[PDB]
Structure formats: C-alpha cells, structure tokens
Design a protein around this ligand. Structure first.
Ligand SMILES: [Cl-]
Ligand SMILES: [Cl-]
Ligand SMILES: [Cl-]
Ligand SMILES: [Cl-]
Ligand code: NA
Ligand code: NA
Ligand SMILES: [Zn+2]
Ligand SMILES: [Zn+2]
Lengths: 428, 428
C-alpha cells in the first residue's frame, strides 16, 4: 500500500553528491543521471489565454536558476522541453467573449509569455511543443493505453483512464506524489480524450470528434522527445495533484513500466497577503506591471532569497522588494569599483609583493567558493549562496579601498562572481 | 638509480580522470589535487630585458588555455603565481648600454610584456612576484639551505648548492626530470648567491654584497606563497634542465622533504623553419610585429591547432597562419548567421514540432559535448576539440539554411560554443 522509488545506478554516471527534494520520495535524495552526465527535463508550460503574473514568474525563474546551476555550475548536459497549452477550455471561453479565434488568442498570449520570460532573463528550453501540433500524436498515445487495457471508451466518444485497472497491476501505483488526494466506471477516473460538442473546436479521432484531455498532452509530448525515462520533471506544487500524478499514470500505462520520472521537483506556492496569487482571486500582479516598478535583477533576487521548494509570502508595496533593491545596489556598486580598478591599474607604479592582506582576502575567496559549492549541493540553497557572495563583497570592498591591490587577485575574484551571477541569471 | 614519484591520494579530492603529460613521471598520469579541488600553480615568467616574440607567446598562451580548461571547464580552484625576473645579467648589461637605469629598464619591458599578453588575451595570474621585491626572502631561503648542509660559501662571498650532499640523502634525488643531462667542490654545483662585480647592482647579505642566482628566486617566491607542495609547475621545455630540476633541488633542500611538485608541465618549443625561435639566431618575430599582421584570435587558433606539449613548426609568410585566418573567418560568420536567425525568428509564425532534423542536430550536439570532454581529459587535446567545434558548426550552418529552426536548440548550441570559446580564449 506504499509506493516505491528506485534510485539510478551510480556506475558510469556523473556523481556530484547533489541532493534534491524529490516529491516522489518526499525527501532529499542524491541526484544520479539515468545516462552519464545527461539530464532529460520536462517542464509544464503556460496555458496561453491571458498574461503571466508573479506566481508564474516564481516557477519559471526558480527552475531557470536550477537549470543554470545544473548546466553552468555542475556542467551537466541538460535537454529541456516545455509545452505550450494552446488548446484549453479557458482559451475557448475567452475566445468567444472577445469574439476572436482560438488560435489568434493563443498565439497572442504565447507571444507575451515568451517576451515576459526574456524580460526576466529566463533561458528558452531546448524544445517547445504546442498541443495543437501534437494532436495526432496524442491520439496514438491514447490508442496504446487502450491497447494495454488501462483505458476505456464511453458511448459519447470520450476516452477515460481506468484507474482501477491501473492499480491492480503490481508494477503500477496511482497517485504516487499525493496518494491521499484521491457513466464512468469510477468517479476518480479522468479523461484522456473528451468528446467535443459540435460548437467546440475538435479533431478527428477513432472514437469521434474531440479534444485532448487536461493531462494527456504532457505525457505524449515528453515521451515522444525524451522517451521512457525522464531525469527531471518540474512544475508548481499545485500541479503535483492531480496533474502530474496523472501524467505518471498515463506514461506508465503507455510504456507498461514502473518509473517514468526519476526526480519530480515542485516549486513552492507564491502567496500575496497569505493567499495564493490567482486570477480568480484578483490579487495577481502581472510580470509587465512588476517590471514597471522593479528590475529583472531585483525580481530574480527575490526568488533567490526564497528557497525554490519552500513556501513564499510576497508583501506588496515593495516591502519584500526593499531587501532585493539593497542587494542589487550592493552588487552594482561592487562591480563598478572592481571593474574600474582592473581597467585603470598600472603595473609599473605598483608594488606586487604578496602581503598578508592579499593572503587573507585570497583565503576568504577560496573559502567562499567552497561554501557556495556546499549550498548548491544542499538542494539549490541559493539564499545562503547569495549571502556568501555578500559577505565576500564586503571584504573585497575594504581591500580595494585601503590595501594595496594585487590586480591578478581582483581579476580572478571578478571572474568567479561573474560566473556565479550568470548561474543566478543576474546581469550587471 | 632512478627517481620515484608519489601520486596524491584520491580520498577527499576532486577526480576528473584528467590525464596530463608529467615530466617527473615522463608519462601521462591521472591528475589528483593535493587538497580537495585546489590547484597550486607556479609558472616561470619572463626576463624583462627586451621584447617578447612568438616563442614566448606560445608558452604563455598554451598555459593560459590550460588554465582556462582547468578553471572554466573542469571548475578546479586554481591559484597561479608568475615571477618577473627583473634582476638578471642581461638586464644589467643592457642597462649600462641604455644608460636609463636598472629598475627603469626592467620596468619598461615588464610593461611591454604585460601589454603583449593583454593583446593575446592572456589572463593575469593570481599573484605576480618581482625578484627585486623578494631579495630579502631569497637571502633567508639560502640561509635555511645552508643550515641543512646543502649549500656552502666560497671565499669571494658566493653561495653554491652542494649537489653531492643533496644526492647522498635517500629522500633527495638530483636531476629528476633530466637525469642524463648532468674553486667549486664540483662542476655541477650551481650558485644560489653571486658575489657582486663592480659597477653591478647589489644587495646586502651575510655572505657579502651580491645578486640572487639564476634559480633561487623561483623556489623562494613559489615556496613563500604556495608552500611545500605545488600541484602544477609549468614552463618551456628548455627550462626543464637545469632551471626546473635545480628548483626542485633547492626546494627539497629548503623543506628537507621528497616532493615539492606533483606535476611538471612543459610546453613544446616553437621552431621557425626547423630551428627554435631565438633572439640569438635573429629569426624571431615579436608579438607586436605579429599583431600588426594577425588578430589575437588567429594567433590563439595557431596554438590551439598544435598540441601544447608537442613540437610545432611555424612557417613564415603566413603559410601556417592561412589556416588560422580561415578558421577565424568561419567562426565570425557562424556567430553572425546564428544571431541573425535568432533575432528574426518569430514564435507565432513558425511550427515548433520536434522534427527528425531537429533530433539529429541535437544528437550531434550532445555527442560533440562528450567528444570535447574526452579531448580535454586527453592531456588538453585542443587540436581535436577545435576540430569538433568546426564539424558541429558546419552541420549547424546546413540546418540553419534549409531546415526549420528550433530557436531554443540554436540558443543552447550557441551558448555551449561560447562556453568552449571562452575556454579557448577566443572572443567573438
Ligand atoms: Cl499564463
Ligand atoms: Cl507551472
Ligand atoms: Cl622576455
Ligand atoms: Cl617560460
Ligand atoms: Na494540488
Ligand atoms: Na634543456
Ligand atoms: Zn503539464
Ligand atoms: Zn623559474
């Protein structure tokens, strides 16, 4: 009555001693690639029917940071895929009210979403998959689930996942990450294919005209590009159930195996004034509106200060952003001085003896490098790594103001801090 | 009758399976840091009495590349020290002819040396040590060697290393890297301290006015800053004997231990028309003169194409540089084309299905990442790594011209190539 997780074998794999909070094990576990240093990563993407707000930014910026740590810092080989849900009930409903076509609405808000991501310096994934371009692939995916006896077709033409048949199999467990949250055979069964009314958009299928169900999209596209095993699957914690648990059931049924994803990472909720940021609650702040008050670096520092997997509470009116603006100011001033000193330094006039002051700054510099390395291994502890950089910057500023300058030491410190800020997504 | 080498223990150390041609073992061996991921590195530096030429550039650029591989690629923690020999017989002889003063002449050519390095994009070391700033430390260093009975004082006031006493100790072996290359007690004894001739600059010492000997400065400066064990010691192959072997004898005598350096890397010499480039042969090409004919990238491509520890022959009149100019042209065009395609790419108009064409380029992209990784582990095989990038760019160019473009895939490929070019010191 308990789900089981199998860790990848270490032989032949890049091992960093990295530990990540995995929602499958509900614990921190060592991260081991399925193959060598490669990481196959699928991330759930936006439903392009409206603007993105700060909550969305929290997920996409937080996992953008984690990706930068994995690639830039640990030198993993990351293959990332994000879907665009351009077919949806919300897209259909908004398109009729606006009296614009479904595809025209979806492409407009898809465009604004990628513009907003670029404004926050979120790297684009390796592959972008639209649901509208994979409808035929979704049908074939559903056909195989039916062939495996894990799906049934209703009279109206819909197709439903058969949870009961899925559970009976010993190899398969349903609702791994949220076990307690759990005309059809069973109420808890969900639709792989929805029979479309004549007034709704539809696609031809063996079972009749219809639309893809909520969850089938991600399982189809991720399996086609990445295959039977995914190293990482990311998303917001809200998507954990029923969305992601249903992705696992669909892909396990399709491949008839036990583990579709080795590591499931979930970003914490963003609450504004104690309630989750939601369009329905009307407490949302769009990414564009946030950018008219704050810079991209400041917004990224906000998410660096709140651990990616933890709960976060945003205080509006700039209460939470006050610290972010102070840190951004400290980084900006530090880079100004160190860059000017490196540029203007004159070797002939200076004395290049290696003094105790030089040795002390050098020892703290190597010490800070190790502190940050432990923090990144500690489930991407960016808040403490950011504090480590600040402590180092305080001592470098003292050294630049008073001590005689070892130009090479400062140049090497600048290269490191630039390397860490590229890992954070900061641009100075 | 043969020297012995002790490999560092792997427990607690960063292991990359990197293999480097070590002149102590005379073979390729796995590189293991003495402590953690740290690398203490000392590289012998210029004698600042004249302009630098292409032969000098080959050594400093080659080890600039290796340093970039160690730090930027493998993320080792490198602490590098370079000396400036601003006291020398050649400097003294030229200073009387120029009548501009000893220190002013030495400071002039030091300035031009650093300007030439900056022109080639050679990063400055962590610490720069001038011999003139360490004469007092050199005296104390010689005093400790005499206290260990490994040096004796002549009547004139010079101090000489006693090789015979050094060899007798079982822990000490003389001429480890070139065993066959081997008044005073013995001809093979070398001078740690030289009694100063009239009209020459001199420094006070217990044994009388004098100048430091040829080799003592490197052992002293490296020992004060880096300590009793050096992970890496670099230089031109000519310096292997007698300079570097005498550095080992001096430092082993000072600390009375067995191994001052774990790894000794020697860059091959650059021959022009079959003879080594030398000022005495009058076949030299200055870095300044070379830079009026070729760009920094082209000069770095020349050294990338010739493996660092192997011999290379430069053909004048641009014969060897013709290939370099072609490669620099292709890299510039690639960055122009890929940036233009990225800029003009429109997300709405394109189709983002992941096609077979995209999958093949992605599979080639990840394969090239592993090819380059093996080359860097293969004793910094930059010639084969550069070929890997060229082949990848040719396939990207074909993909960009005809196939449909996955914007995310191209951006990720461009970032990797920028990451490799930053390791090479190329700037586009
Ligand atoms: Cl959205
Ligand atoms: Cl999400
Ligand atoms: Cl020189
Ligand atoms: Cl040299
Ligand atoms: Na939920
Ligand atoms: Na020699
Ligand atoms: Zn999804
Ligand atoms: Zn030296």
């Amino acid at each position: 009555s308990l789900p089981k997780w199998n860790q990848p074998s270490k032989e032949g794999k890049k091992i960093t001693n990295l530990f990540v909070n995995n929602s499958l094990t509900h614990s921190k576990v060592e991260f081991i690639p399925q193959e060598g240093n490669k990481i196959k990563w699928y991330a759930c993407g936006p439903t392009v029917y409206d603007a993105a707000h700060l909550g969305h930014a929290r997920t996409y910026v937080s996992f953008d940071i984690i990706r930068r740590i994995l690639v830039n810092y640990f030198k993993y080989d990351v293959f990332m895929v994000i879907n665009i849900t351009d077919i949806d009930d919300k897209i259909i409903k908004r398109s009729v009210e606006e009296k614009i076509g479904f595809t025209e609405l979806a492409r407009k808000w898809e465009y604004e979403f990628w513009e907003d991501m670029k404004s926050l310096n979120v790297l684009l994934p390796t592959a972008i998959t639209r649901v509208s371009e994979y409808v035929g692939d979704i049908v074939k995916y559903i056909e195989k689930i039916i062939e495996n006896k894990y799906a049934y077709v209703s009279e109206e033409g819909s197709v439903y996942f058969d949870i009961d048949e899925f559970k009976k199999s010993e190899k398969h467990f349903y609702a791994r990450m949220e076990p307690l949250s759990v005309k059809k055979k069973n109420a808890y069964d969900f639709a792989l294919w929805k029979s479309s009314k004549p007034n709704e958009p539809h696609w031809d299928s063996p079972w009749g005209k219809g639309r893809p169900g909520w969850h089938i999209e991600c399982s189809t596209m991720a399996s086609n590009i990445l295959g039977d095993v995914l190293d990482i699957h990311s998303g917001g914690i809200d998507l954990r159930f029923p969305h992601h648990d249903n992705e696992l059931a669909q892909s396990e049924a399709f491949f008839d195996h036990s583990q579709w994803v080795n590591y499931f990472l979930h970003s914490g909720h963003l609450h504004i004034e104690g309630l989750k940021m939601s369009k329905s609650l009307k407490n949302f702040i769009t990414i564009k509106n946030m950018l008219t008050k704050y810079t991209s670096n400041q917004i990224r520092i906000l998410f660096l200060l709140n651990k990616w997997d933890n709960f976060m509470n945003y205080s509006p009116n700039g209460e939470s952003m006050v610290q972010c603006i102070e840190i951004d100011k400290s980084f900006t001033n530090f880079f100004a001085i160190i860059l000017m000193k490196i540029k203007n330094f004159d070797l002939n006039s200076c004395n290049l003896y290696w003094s105790d002051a030089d040795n002390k700054l050098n020892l703290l510099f190597r010490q800070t490098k190790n502190k940050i390395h432990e923090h990144f291994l500690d489930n991407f502890n960016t808040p403490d790594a950011l504090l480590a950089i600040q402590k180092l910057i305080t001592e470098i500023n003292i050294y630049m103001d008073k001590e005689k300058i070892q130009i090479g030491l400062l140049l090497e410190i600048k290269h490191y801090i630039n390397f860490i800020f590229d890992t954070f997504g900061l641009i100075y």
